[PDB]
């Protein structure tokens with residue numbers, strides 16, 4: 001055996017580390033996965049805050065680059081493509097394209113994750129008796145708004161930037177899957193394909209890619225295994 | 229007269245465009261400010277969504293670069309320093325430093341703005357009768373948590389990256405000022421300097437810089453002028 005290139009600190013249920021898992025699989029990069037257990041607050045212990053002072057997953061250690069550490073899922077995506085996507089299979093080369101890819105990543109990080117996450121909190125993930133569908137509705141409406149925004153551009157472009165698949169597209173996949181299957185499933189008649197057909201086209205193209213499909217399957221199995 | 233380099237679409241009350249205003253003043257760059265009026269939903273009209281399909285401010289037009297447009301406040305900060313900070317007065321040169329500056333920007337964008345904003349919504353900014361201090365408390369606690377995170381690093385470093393002032397630091401200023409003066413002012417005995425002395429040191433150093441002080445003063449005047 002040989003030590004793998006990366007350690008990815010991930011979680012079975014939480015969406016965010018799976019963006020990085022998807023990219024690592026797409027690029028064929030070697031990595032071990034360590035599930036940080038949020039219930040014993042392992043993520044808030046010195047042993048993990050030494051990697052991320054924010055004490056949230058994911059974080060990535062690059063063992064083949066002097067154990068360099070990066071946290072924030074979308075910064076990790078940028079780190080990986082800058083250093084390990086020299087053919088720009090999932091990224092871009094020109095300044096103009098790079099800054100717009102970054103813009104879309106910031107939109108994902110500030111406008112998708114946090115709001116979709118509040119829906120998740122109030123609907124499904126908060127302790128059962130702290131859940132609250134009324135407050136959740138504010139964030140379900142924000143999910144639909146974000147879907148509307150994505151619809152407005154994807155009806156006229158195949159991919160978010162430079163007419164090619166990049167980490168900008170990949171970064172949205174895990175929370176969109178969570179929204180479609182949980183957060184707005186059954187919400188005011190929500191029907192993904194009918195209501196947001198361009199977003200559905202793009203999302204479907206993403207999740208049917210073998211690396212991304214494999215990532216989603218791995219997540220489902222990891223969740224299942226928690227109760228083994 | 230001569231057309232200024234940038235149009236910054238801003239708002240008088242909302243914090244986010246002021247990050248960009250601060251950076252433009254720091255660099256001595258020329259810009260006009262257009263306040264988009266959110267009450268007539270001008271930001272959701274074709275005339276503004278043509279600049280930002282997300283329909284939120286800020287957005288920036290670079291008139292001296294073929295009217296190139298960037299939105300997401302923190303992507304705008306990156307755009308400006310990549311193209312117009314060649315001496316790295318507010319940014320960094322090496323890959324290792326750049327990716328960590330980006331990591332901190334992602335932390336600001338996903339972990340400060342959105343959560344501080346939910347506190348703002350439930351406490352102060354939502355329509356008066358939709359406000360809710362109980363739900364707001366969840367986000368006030370998150371503000372203190374983020375302050376704790378910043379405290380844990382700023383007690384041992386002067387600035388977030390590379391031991392020099394960068395847009396990573398600047399990006400946090402406007403929401404921190406909002407939190408200290410509004411969102412957690414009077415919350416469970418909150419005292420910024422006593423409770424988070426390193427964050428207080430760093431924040432104070434930032435807001436006493438003449439460009440940033442001028443930005444804050446300009447914002448206060450613009451707000452005042454709305455009721456003229």
Ligand SMILES: N[C@@H](CCC(=O)N[C@@H](CSSC[C@H](NC(=O)CC[C@H](N)C(=O)O)C(=O)NCC(=O)O)C(=O)NCC(=O)O)C(=O)O
Pocket residue numbers: 011013014015016017038043055056057058071072073074109112113114115116117118120121125334338339
């Ligand atoms: N911007 C960061 C967010 C990372 C993140 O949220 N990680 C979660 C696991 S994914 S699970 C999704 C996550 N929800 C939570 O973390 C729920 C608990 C939290 N403390 C709360 O009060 O909401 C969320 O809503 N995220 C918003 C987003 O993605 O921007 C975590 O470590 N939680 C441990 C903890 O917080 O103690 C990134 O992209 O890396």
Ligand SMILES: N[C@@H](CCC(=O)N[C@@H](CSSC[C@H](NC(=O)CC[C@H](N)C(=O)O)C(=O)NCC(=O)O)C(=O)NCC(=O)O)C(=O)O
Pocket residue numbers: 106110111239241242243244245266271283284285286299300301302337340341342343344345346348349353
């Ligand atoms: N990630 C973006 C956020 C930009 C943003 O929030 N812009 C606000 C003005 S600053 S005002 C701060 C803003 N609050 C709001 O925008 C309040 C109304 C909103 N629709 C809601 O329901 O909360 C907020 O909480 N932001 C979270 C963050 O900064 O990440 C806007 O245009 N609002 C018009 C609208 O939404 O219709 C950025 O950094 O550019």
